């Protein structure tokens, strides 16, 4: 079996994942939306109450 992915490889790929960030407003509340660089789907990640803009969480 020449193709196996071990847990160490899974964690390395997860830590090397890039995202595109976009701020949106919903019902007067601000949310952060992100899209994975290798996909075309956007999703709402978190709100500004739990995230600090300007850092790398």
């Amino acid at each position: 079996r020449k193709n196996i992915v071990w847990p160490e490889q899974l964690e390395e790929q997860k830590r090397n994942k890039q995202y595109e960030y976009q701020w949106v407003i919903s019902n007067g509340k601000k949310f952060i939306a992100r899209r994975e660089s290798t996909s075309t789907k956007w999703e709402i990640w978190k709100s500004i109450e739990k995230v600090t803009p300007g850092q790398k969480p």
Binding site: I4, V5, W6, P7, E8
Partner: protein, 306 residues
């Protein structure tokens, strides 16, 4: 060779002799892991992975390895055959575990490098290593079971296992249950090593090996009592050649064995050689299994042609 007197005696420790309550239990002999102290639970989460069964089918989807598939779920363990990462750091054995993918036993070892977090690894268990033992590798280690050293620092008569053909790729030669290899002499840049099959070969002195044997001495005493016991392991039944029809096998016809025994593709299977006569690796093999000199094998059809 299994005999019914062996099961009746019920002598060898470490085996489970199932009482003949049913037809499928009369000849069944297994291994008692609890009596041996071998852990038979789930593997370490950070050193294991769940994978689908292939059932002997390649990327084209066709059967290339016959009589496979239909077993239980498969989980694979990652084993560090080369301990070059942890050369200086000593390791403490936590458990000895059983793996259905191999015939030997694996050992879980924890390392504590200075200034870092603990590290866990799997290693092929030597013959006489139990939980709590200390394993060491690299220069400055004693010549004792479980130690990994280059061939330049191993005595001639000491049995070894998990030997590396290449300097740093990893051990590949001696892995099966209760097997070992010995060193006969050491030359300028090579050592003469006798392999478990009885072959004498040249191996570079910078390769590494582990002192001792493999850690399962009850492999040959097992008897599966049922057909379904090997079905659960992932093996399927096979049909004899003379039982098939002419369009299926060379032995298909009504008569039995009209022609000398051969493979399904017509190759004689009772002594015909399959290794390449001009194989590049002939330069490292001194004597083949059974005592045949390499030159006798390399130059056998050339004399007949002449």
């Amino acid at each position: 060779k299994y005999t019914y007197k062996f099961k009746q005696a019920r002598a060898v420790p470490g085996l489970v002799y199932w009482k003949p309550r049913t037809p499928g239990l009369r000849h069944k002999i297994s291994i008692d892991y609890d009596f041996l102290g071998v852990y038979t639970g789930a593997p370490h989460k950070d050193l294991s992975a769940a994978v689908p069964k292939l059932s002997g089918r390649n990327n084209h989807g066709r059967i290339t390895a016959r009589h496979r598939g239909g077993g239980m779920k498969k989980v694979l363990r990652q084993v560090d055959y080369s301990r070059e990462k942890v050369d200086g750091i000593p390791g403490v054995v936590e458990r000895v575990e059983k793996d259905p993918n191999r015939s030997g036993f694996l050992a879980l070892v924890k390392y504590q490098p200075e200034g870092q977090l603990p590290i866990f690894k799997y290693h092929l268990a030597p013959a006489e290593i139990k939980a709590g033992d200390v394993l060491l590798s690299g220069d400055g280690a004693p010549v004792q079971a479980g130690s990994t050293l280059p061939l330049r620092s191993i005595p001639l008569g000491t049995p070894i296992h998990n030997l590396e053909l290449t300097p740093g790729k990893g051990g590949q030669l001696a892995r099966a249950a209760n097997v070992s290899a010995v060193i006969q002499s050491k030359q300028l840049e090579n050592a003469i090593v006798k392999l478990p099959s009885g072959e004498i070969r040249l191996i570079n002195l910078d390769c590494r090996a582990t002192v001792g044997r493999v850690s399962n001495h009850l492999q040959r005493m097992i008897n599966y009592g049922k057909a379904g016991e090997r079905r659960k392991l992932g093996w399927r039944p096979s049909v004899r050649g003379i039982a098939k029809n002419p369009n299926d096998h060379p032995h298909g016809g009504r008569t039995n064995g009209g022609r000398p025994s051969c493979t399904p593709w017509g190759v004689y299977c009772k002594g015909q050689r399959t290794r390449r006569r001009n194989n590049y690796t002939n330069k490292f093999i001194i004597t083949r299994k059974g005592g045949q000199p390499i030159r006798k094998f390399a130059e056998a059809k050339k004399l007949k042609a002449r």
